[PDB]
Structures are given as structure tokens and as C-alpha cells.
């Protein structure tokens, strides 16, 4: 059926530019208008721009006027968004969407969305995380269950992956969504609950992988005496 | 703010009771009201919560399907309907106001309790 | 600019329930209103257009109603596939979305297990102390974590993260991280997190002494 595939997202410094593209298939691209729509946790779903089937009329959200330009190549079935003078508040997942087929005297909106491409506007530089143990003790022990983990702190950009004992330990693992700190770096924890009787003899190691920096870190988590 | 529970008593297995929790000194329409219970030798344990009208009611595993909490905001009172009662339900039952309108469970004010005994 | 508002923000609901969510426009949009569904990590999907017309393939348990400023979406009998966030969108004058209504998986109440973790010596050597409080496998989502350092309430130096509902039991877990400098950390003794939740009859405190561990 209709398929839309975005590309071109990445990390960009404030004031620089980025060009997104959207490859369309499964429908006559040159017959339909197209939308760019973005989603950020702070502003929800937000329409960005529309272009006509023939590229004639273009319209833009007030918050991007003068900085963004929507365009299209009908011979290549491709939609484009040029983003200049980027700002932190432009950080979002950007989706292209196909205008639906409506009847002549009607308003219209979108029927099919792409899976999105992520744009991150930040002054932070690529950095692997520091990995610190979250040590079990009597203070993380309730009955026969103890909690332990790893703090994966001060990395940029997303994402990081965390495994335990090279993948042999999966039951009871919670890896939390990252929070963006006031420094502009991300931080998260990964924890696991285990039998309290295993502490001090069973080895527990968290394996942290941060592909943007090629960081791989194993951290052995040993109990404390309190 | 004062809370007082009533409606407890001696009931047969399979019987029904209705507990009431009347509040004075403060309008409780904006607050979630919770029921807890305590049996000898055990800790006070959660039974059910009536949040504000429209925000739903939530229940403990041990009473799901049998107990129902409701509100009479006009009369500043909340209720726990208890059906299909079991010996295991024997306890003193307490109501508490959640002082946090965003429902984090800040139970500052508690009633004195009403006794429920399921036997014979 | 037409303003769209949805209610409620979150609805805790169960399989088989009849569910109605509402969407209001700041001025008349006639019936130019669409409803899209979105699951985490996924693109939105068109459910309803022109306020009440179902998109092809959308199951018949969905319906929509309204014209002017007040609109509703109704699921006659909810199914697991319907747990998602729903957005309305007016397309009478440009395009603006509501804030979204999330259908949440209702379950029985479970109080959190509470654990605390002191900072590692490795991080202390680098001049910072992070202390972590973990609330494990609880429901409903609302909870309060308060950090106390020598029995003084902290504010402005902690951050929280909450998981999505667990695929197995639909519970939440929550991490709270208090971050101080090494000097501020060494200026005090007792570090505690105090936890409240509607499933707990009294607050649960976990604490340690600096230098005890």
C-alpha cells in the first residue's frame, strides 16, 4: 500500500541547517498534496507545512516561517523539508504525511504517515556515558528480593543500550527512559531484582553500549556492607 | 477534619455489609477517599480507593469483584459495599483522606475504625 | 488560531468497557474533525474523518459524533489493541491537534517496593554524588518521592523517570536521582527517600548514612 519513508534526521547545532527527505511509494505521488508534521514531548503533535500536488502553493506554521522550506520532486517521488536557522525548540520527530483523497468542495487532512525521522538541535557534543554501579545492600533488600543496577550518566545523543550478564539475565530488568539534564546530556538507570541469597557470590555485570561514540562499558555491581 | 466509620458488625460467610465514612470540618468532594483494613498480627492493608467523581475507583486483589466503593458528595460521605464476605475479611476497617488532590496518597486524616467479623 | 482541547488526559480503562473521550474546539469547525490513534514509537493512524466517518479497515466498535465545537469518540467495547493515545485534529482552518487522550490499562492496586542506592566511590572520586531511589512494580501511576538530607526536604536537585506499563503485569516503576557535588554530599550524613502511594497506609522511608556503606 502507501508507504512514506523519511530520512535526513540527526544532531545539529543551533543556527545550522538540515535537509529532510521523504520517499513515497504505492500511490501516484504527483496527484496528492503532502504535509510535514512534527512531534515533541513539549508541544505534542504540530503541523509544520503543506505543499500542493504540483508544488504551487505552500503554507507554513507561524513558528517555522522564514526558516523552513517545503519542496517536492515529482519525477523522483520525493518530498523535501529544508530547515535553516534551527533552534532547540525544533527538536522533534518529523513525519511526512499524505493528504487524503477528498471530494472537490471539502477541506482535507492526512491519511497515511511515515514512521518519522528524529531531529535534535543541541550544543552538546558526542560523549559516551559514565557507568556507575547501583550497589545492593540491606537498603535495597526486602525479604528474599534485592535490587541492584547501573547508572548510565552524562551521554549524548540518544540512544544507549543496556544488557545484563551479556544477555543471560533478562527477568526483572527495568531500563528507565532517559532524562535530559540541565547540562544537555542524558542520564538513565537500569535496575534488576534478584534473589537476596545470591548477593556476594553471583556475579552481576551491566553491559552498556553507546554506538554514536563507540562506547562499550562493562560494570560489575558488587554489594555494599550497609 | 474528622472522619467516622460505621456499618461494621457480625456477618455470616456469604453475607453483605455496607460501611460508611462520614467527614466533618472539610468538604471532601475534591479528595480521594480510601479504605484500609487491619487484622490481628498483620499490617494495615489497602482495600479500595474512590477518587473524585469521574476519576474512577481502584481495588485490592483480595476484594476485586466483591467490594464496591461509592460516594455521596452531597452528604460528604463515602461507602464500601462488601458482598460475598469471607472469614478472611474479618478486620477493623478504616477510611482515610488523600490530602493530595493529585492522588499521591498523602493520608493525613484517618477514621477511628469500624469492626467487621465474618464467622459462623 | 483554533485551539483544540481533549478530555480526559488519561483514562484508566478495561477490556470490554464502553469508552467515550471528548474534544472541544475554541470556535466552530463545522464537522471538519479527524481522529488519529498512536502507540509508543509508532506513527499515528487515521481512524475517523468528518467527525463521524470511519476510515476503511477501522473496526465497527469505533464511532464519532459532533458538529460545531463539541465532539466525541466512542469505543463500544474496548479491546487490547485499543490501548493507545488518541488525538483529535480540526482541519477547518489549517491544522491543529488536541493534546491527546491516553487509554491506560486499569488493574488492581499494588504498592511499590522501595530501594535506595548510595553513590559509587568511582563517581565520588570525580566530584559528584548521585543517590538513586527506586519504586518497583506499582499501580496506579501516581506516587510521591521526597528526598531528605539530614531531615531537610530537598528541592530542585532531583529528576524522575517512569517506565511504560509493564507488558506482563501492567505495573509502573520509577527512578528518582538526587545529584549533589562531592563537597555538598560530604557536608551531610543521612540521606533518605520517603515514598507515598495510594496503596501505602504510611510513607515508606529508605535511608543510609554517608560513610556507613
Residue numbers in the entry:
A (entry chain H): 1 to 52, 52A, 53 to 82, 82A, 82B, 82C, 83 to 100, 100A, ...
B (entry chain K): 2 to 121
C (entry chain L): 1 to 94, 96 to 214
From the paper:
Here, we characterize IGHV3-33/IGKV1-5-encoded monoclonal antibody (mAb) 850 elicited by immunization of transgenic mice with human immunoglobulin loci. mAb 850 binds repeating NANP motifs with picomolar affinity, potently inhibits Plasmodium falciparum (Pf) in vitro and, when passively administered in a mouse challenge model, reduces liver burden to a similar extent as some of the most potent anti-PfCSP mAbs yet described. PfCSP contains a largely disordered central region composed of only five amino acids (aa; asparagine, alanine, valine, aspartate and proline) arranged in a large number of repeating NANP and NANP-like motifs (NPDP and NVDP). Multiple antibodies can bind the repeating epitopes concurrently by engaging into homotypic Fab-Fab interactions, which results in the ordering of the otherwise largely disordered central repeat into a spiral. Like other IGHV3-33/IGKV1-5-encoded anti-NANP antibodies, mAb 850 primarily utilizes its HCDR3 and germline-encoded aromatic residues to recognize its core NANP motif.
To understand the molecular basis underlying the Pf inhibitory activity of mAb 850, we obtained a co-crystal structure of 850 Fab in complex with the NANP3 peptide at 2.2 Å resolution, as well as a crystal structure of unliganded 850 Fab at 2.0 Å. No significant changes in conformation for mAb 850 were observed upon binding the NANP3 peptide (all-atom RMSD between the two structures equals 0.6 Å), with the exception of the orientation of side-chains of Heavy Chain Complementarity-Determining Region 3 (HCDR3) residues Asn100C and Tyr100D. mAb 850 recognizes the NANP3 peptide in an extended conformation with residues number three to six (NPNA motif) adopting a type I β-turn.
